[PDB]
Design a protein around this nucleic acid. Structure first.
Lengths: 129, 232, 100, 91, 103, 178
RNA sequence: AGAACCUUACCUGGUCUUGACAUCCACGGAAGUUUUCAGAGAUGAGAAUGUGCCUUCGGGAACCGUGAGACAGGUGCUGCAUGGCUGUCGUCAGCUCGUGUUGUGAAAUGUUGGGUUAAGUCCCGCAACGAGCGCAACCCUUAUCCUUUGUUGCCAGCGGUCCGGCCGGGAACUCAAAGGAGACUGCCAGUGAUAAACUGGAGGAAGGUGGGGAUGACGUCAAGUCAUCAUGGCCCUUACGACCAGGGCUACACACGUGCUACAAUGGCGCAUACAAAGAGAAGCGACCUCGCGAGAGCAAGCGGACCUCAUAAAGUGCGUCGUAGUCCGGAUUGGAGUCUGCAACUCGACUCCAUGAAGUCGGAAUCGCUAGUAAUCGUGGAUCAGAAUGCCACGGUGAAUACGU
């Protein structure tokens, strides 16, 4: 039992911290408004796509803090982060969101820049003759 | 001739360094050049003893030497005068006054460096060396361990080319990241120029001999562990 | 390389370090805008023939073990080739192979 | 163009030779190696023989050169013309 | 939040040595005093070096080295003169330097 | 060649509509790794398509993607002193990827003052089978209908199967001469 | 890995020879410090402080000059004379150690056949047997996830409250560095020669030795370093030594390897706007401060580092603006002043901005990397670092086509 239930929104090594509870459908993103953060952007439709799918736009209340990523990318991280937090309206919720893929952590991990190579795999370029 | 040198990749897990001190970044060169000076001059005075390792350690206001030998008494010399002259030139070399303790003596008759020293002497003295390396390998596997590699170089027999030869027997892993495995390359001179022996020896695939602590903080150490969670 | 050229490089570097710490705000005081119709005096700058060697512009250090120029590393007091030789032999505290 | 910032230069090499040469008004070409060094009012009417790395070249000091260095008049490098390569240095 | 009263810091190259010395301090501080905390791990530093691998040439192949430096904070809320005495008698570590100086 | 069977990456439906056909499209719309712009360039494009006909946003997109579609590719596999050509059937996944690739190559030269307008306009033409990638479909089909004459190293391969307790017919499997 | 001078292997100019520097010996001077002037500076002439150290009280040593020797010194030559060490093939999928047999023996065999793998992995099996190397693994690192600390970290709620972890205070929460949890083609299904193994199934972050890395056999290749560093042969030792300065490798005839950034409009510009990671900083950077067109400047709280700063992180986002005209892209060159790091900005270092103002519109021969956090693309810090990154190292942002076929 808790004041807000919580999802960690881990997507491509960026983290959306996301606190869910029952209310009237309200958003706070980065101690500010949606207008400020995602101003005139498709990014508002990213975070809404899973919330429209379980049909609870006007029912879920939220508080959102996020570090790392690109702005279009942060919205993408939140889109898993809200569904990580949702687990207890019903028991099956976290199963069916994982099955829709919005619990699922981005299983591709970084590759180091390698020594003697100009990138991660990119071996040098030489015409030398 | 491929592969990284065998002790340099093992230092982050279960193998010690040949030196361990701390100098707070800015002074790390001043400590390294002085640590290299103790290695170079100290072992040079004890040339006449027999030695497997040198382990250098720096607490506050002290340099403490650990030294590894074929037997406990070789480095002590008569009534402690020989080892006091050793602590004499360390205090002189280092920026602090000097300490020395002798380590545990362990597997000294098959040990990497006490074997390599032993092989280099044969060549030094222009002895025939017809079996000498093959018997090095044999005696080492007769005294302990699980595998050995010996590679011998220095113009074998008096050839006017480079001419190496080698022998490995039992299990000697090459890409291993776990356990200490003991390697030494000796350098020494003879009539036709410089010679050298490479001794890789492998005692076991697991050694526990340096690790991070066993436990999470709460079950380790102090009974009353709990934080206030405010209360400045 | 040669030992005369190494002997020279080593003599520049202890006076570089010696003089330049004490000159840290002196550059601003004797030379730049804080010396507005102030200092700029021939009578303190006829003293600079010993300090030609003691200059920050000669605080390139090079090797502490060998005195050899170019490719230096101040944190070991060694250079590329000579760090590796020592790292092989375990001489340097904390030094390991990287994997990640 | 690049300049000398804010600070004061008299050059150590020139200073002891120039004091004793202005007392003469002018004397014999001053064996000078300091081709890093600027020209100053104190030096107007002197003759500075400026080592270029192989030998000295005499530089006549006068008001139209005081914006300028002893190393700008005394050469180093060579420009290869390409009828046939160049033997000589150019002032 | 807290304001740092005094800074107790352990700085080391060896990852294992700092972990043994902090745990010892945490005990010493409880064995001679009443107001201790579990040692904050504090973030570890890493410096990056790349060097040649052959003595001469072989530019492609290179070699890459890490040196780790581990920092612990402990955060005793109040050190007893006895905590500082005990710490200083039972010191023996080499891979770490402990600073009881502040900054 | 090749020790074992290897898979492929999979595109996963886009965040504004829930379509794999949209998410594969924006991916081939990506220029210098800058996807958040190629996103705006797709969503504005899809809205311009809704002003041309409002019953669906994809109206011209879907039908361009049938009409400029390749069915065939040309490969070459030597017969002695000559190379020749042998036509091959493409899988739907590459059939599409070729079409989408020609559609954006065609959008980048229309010269109009924003790519959202260019891409809506090159789909509007390529939908009627009037645009730029009709030619690319026709040329690749003219070689594929013509070059049905030649086949892959027939004379020795046919024997290389007949002797290894294979059939009197060419076996489509690794490290055999086919 | 940061070649003005020092950086010097090169080259030119001054100058001495037990020699820059150590040990050992003889004579004079303490070494050290401070200071004018000739000479580039070495060096020389004079001034002033001191007369330490040990003591047959003679005299010596430390150090400096002078001299005798022993001797230092040398990127000085030789890579088919070497050692130390490392590159290639190549992640080939093979290679070797102990032993027996078969041949007269070189040598074979194993190390080869079929099926399969990342694999000497595994089913079957022959005079190859027994076993190791590569590979598999522990391994670091990432990733969820369990797990603890709870600050210089964090803040669902609560107090002071502009509702900012600033602080009273709080553990739901990432979050740091670390014990580690999980995954084994093991399971169950299909396939597959019985079989290894592949692919599906399912719970989970994840199925394919979970991502990534470490990782690379014996060793030919006559690979390459005497120049980190060791060293015989082998040369100078009034020097292939050494004090002191200026010049160069970054020239200029040109060709050529590499990368950056641009050639647009998916973009460039202005104004406005958002979130990083990781690490470095005491000769240094640095809030606020006042000054300047700007660059910068002078002053200065502060900074062992999740304490302060580097830092405005950019790409991305908003709005308006631009039309193939080298422009509304791109803005290079150079005169001139203002500025910087430095006793020196001229050939070999950094920037502003005034005046004027070009090449480049996707590039011929040539030419390379990639199976996925990869390729592609953007910015940041660090190693070096007086000045100077297009580079290197690594970090975090954004992130693709397809793998039918040999």
């Amino acid at each position: 039992a808790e004041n807000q239930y919580y999802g960690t929104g881990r997507r491509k090594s960026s983290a959306a911290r996301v606190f869910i509870k029952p209310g009237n459908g309200k958003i706070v993103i980065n101690q500010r408004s949606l207008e400020q953060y995602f101003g005139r952007e498709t990014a508002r439709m990213v975070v809404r796509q899973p919330l429209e799918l379980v049909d609870m736009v006007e029912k879920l209340d939220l508080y959102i803090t996020v570090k790392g990523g690109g702005i279009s990318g942060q919205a993408g991280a939140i889109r898993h982060g809200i569904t990580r937090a949702l687990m207890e309206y019903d028991e099956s919720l976290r199963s069916e969101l994982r099955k829709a893929g919005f619990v699922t952590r981005d299983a591709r991990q970084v590759e180091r820049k390698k020594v003697g190579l100009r990138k991660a795999r990119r071996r040098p370029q030489f015409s030398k003759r | 001739g491929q592969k990284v040198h065998p002790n340099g990749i093992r230092l982050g897990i279960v193998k010690p360094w040949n030196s361990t001190w701390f100098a707070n970044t800015k002074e790390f060169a001043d400590n390294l050049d002085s640590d290299f000076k103790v290695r170079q001059y100290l072992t040079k005075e004890l040339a006449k003893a027999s030695v497997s390792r040198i382990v250098i350690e720096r607490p506050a206001k002290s340099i403490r030497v650990t030294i590894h030998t074929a037997r406990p008494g070789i480095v002590i010399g008569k009534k402690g005068e020989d080892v006091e002259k050793l602590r004499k030139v360390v205090a002189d070399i280092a920026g602090v006054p000097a300490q020395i303790n002798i380590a545990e003596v362990r597997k000294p008759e098959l040990d990497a460096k006490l074997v390599a020293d032993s092989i280099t002497s044969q060549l030094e003295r222009r002895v025939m060396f017809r079996r000498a390396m093959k018997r090095a390998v044999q005696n080492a596997m007769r005294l302990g361990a699980k595998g050995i590699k010996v590679e011998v170089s220095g113009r074998l027999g008096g050839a006017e080319i480079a001419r190496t030869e080698w022998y490995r027997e039992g299990r000697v892993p090459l890409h291993t990241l776990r356990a200490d495995i003991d390697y030494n390359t000796s350098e020494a001179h003879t009539t036709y120029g410089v010679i050298g022996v490479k001794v890789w020896i492998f005692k076991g695939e697991i050694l526990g001999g340096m690790a991070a602590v066993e436990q999470p903080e709460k079950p380790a150490a102090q009974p009353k562990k709990q934080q206030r969670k405010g209360r400045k | 390389a040669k030992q005369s050229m190494k002997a020279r490089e080593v003599k520049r570097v202890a006076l570089a370090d010696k003089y330049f710490a004490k000159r840290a705000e002196l550059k601003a005081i004797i030379s730049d805008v804080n010396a507005s119709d102030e200092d700029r005096w021939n009578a303190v700058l006829k003293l600079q023939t010993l300090p030609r060697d003691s200059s920050p512009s000669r605080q390139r250090n090079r090797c502490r073990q060998t005195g050899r120029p170019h490719g230096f590393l101040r944190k070991f007091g060694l250079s590329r080739i000579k760090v590796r030789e020592a790292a092989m032999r375990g001489e340097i505290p904390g030094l390991k192979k990287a994997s990640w | 163009p690049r300049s000398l910032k804010k600070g004061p230069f008299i050059d150590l090499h020139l200073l002891k030779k120039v004091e004793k040469a202005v007392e003469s008004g002018d004397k014999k070409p001053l064996r000078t190696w300091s081709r890093r060094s600027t020209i100053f009012p104190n030096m107007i009417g002197l003759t500075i023989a400026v080592h270029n790395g192989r030998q000295h070249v005499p530089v006549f000091v006068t008001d139209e050169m005081v914006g300028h260095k002893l190393g700008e008049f005394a050469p180093t490098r060579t420009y290869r013309g390409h009828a046939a390569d160049k033997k000589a240095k150019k002032k | 939040m807290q304001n740092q009263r005094i800074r107790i810091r352990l700085k080391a190259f060896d990852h294992r040595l700092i972990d043994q010395a902090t745990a010892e301090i945490v005990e010493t501080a409880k064995r001679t005093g009443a107001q201790v905390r579990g040692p904050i791990p504090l973030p570890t530093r890493k410096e990056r070096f790349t060097v040649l691998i052959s003595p001469h040439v072989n530019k492609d192949a290179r070699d890459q080295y890490e040196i780790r430096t581990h920092l612990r904070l402990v955060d005793i809320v109040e050190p007893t003169e006895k905590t500082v005495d005990a710490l200083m008698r039972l010191d023996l570590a080499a891979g770490v330097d402990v600073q009881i100086s502040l900054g | 060649p090749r020790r074992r069977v290897i898979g492929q990456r999979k595109i996963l439906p886009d965040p504004k509509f829930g379509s794999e056909l949209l998410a594969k499209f924006v991916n081939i719309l990506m220029v210098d790794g800058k996807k958040s712009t190629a996103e705006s360039i797709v969503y504005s494009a899809l809205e311009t398509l809704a002003q041309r006909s409002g019953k669906s946003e994809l109206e011209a997109f879907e039908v361009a993607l049938e009409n400029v579609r390749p069915t065939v590719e040309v490969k070459s596999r030597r017969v002695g002193g000559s190379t020749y050509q042998v036509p091959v059937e493409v899988r739907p996944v590459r059939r599409n990827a070729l079409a989408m690739r020609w559609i954006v190559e065609a959008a980048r030269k229309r010269g109009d003052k924003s790519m959202a307008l260019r891409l809506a306009n090159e789909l509007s033409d390529a939908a009627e089978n009037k645009g730029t990638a009709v030619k690319k479909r026709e040329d690749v089909h003219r070689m594929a209908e013509a070059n049905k004459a030649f086949a892959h190293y027939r004379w020795l391969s046919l024997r290389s199967f007949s002797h290894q307790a294979g059939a009197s017919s060419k076996q489509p499997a690794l490290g055999y001469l086919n």
